[PDB]
Amino acid sequence: MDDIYKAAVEQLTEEQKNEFKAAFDIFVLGAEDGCISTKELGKVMRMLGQNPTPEELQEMIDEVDEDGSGTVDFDEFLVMMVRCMKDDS
Ligand SMILES: [Ca+2]
């Protein structure tokens, strides 16, 4: 975990986390603690306007997950987005 991605999540604009913060609450609307589970991620992205595959959902998530929790919180949830936004070198 270098200091490159950490800045990628902060570089986001205030309007980016403002609108996404709303949808995020839509996936946790069913969760028990208030987080977006990877199981619904597919439906979460399908309506968000994305087209993630079934093997990429958990894969990418389990890859960006650092607290070894399994659910995608605003912390890992954002890193998973900036990832598909900026990949490769
Ligand atoms: Ca996690």
CATH uppermost class: Mainly Alpha
CATH-defined superfamily: EF-hand
C-alpha end-to-end distance: 16 Å
Structural class by secondary-structure content: mainly alpha
- The coarse silhouette is globular
Largest sheet: none
In percent, how helical is the residue content? 55-70%
As for the CATH topology, it is Recoverin, domain 1
Radius of gyration: 12 Å
**Percent range for β-strand residues:** under 5%
CATH architecture: Orthogonal Bundle
The arrangement of helices and strands along the chain is HHHHH
Helix tally equals: 5
Q: Total strand count, please?
A: 0
Bound molecules: calcium ion
Total domain count: 1
Keywords: Acetylation, Calcium, Cardiomyopathy, Disease variant, Metal-binding, Muscle protein, Phosphoprotein, Repeat
Modified residues (N-acetylmethionine): 1
Domain EF-hand: 16-51, 52-87
Protein name: Troponin C, slow skeletal and cardiac muscles
Task: Describe the structure concisely.
It is classed as calcium-binding. The chain is mainly alpha-helical and 89 residues long. It has five helices and no strands.
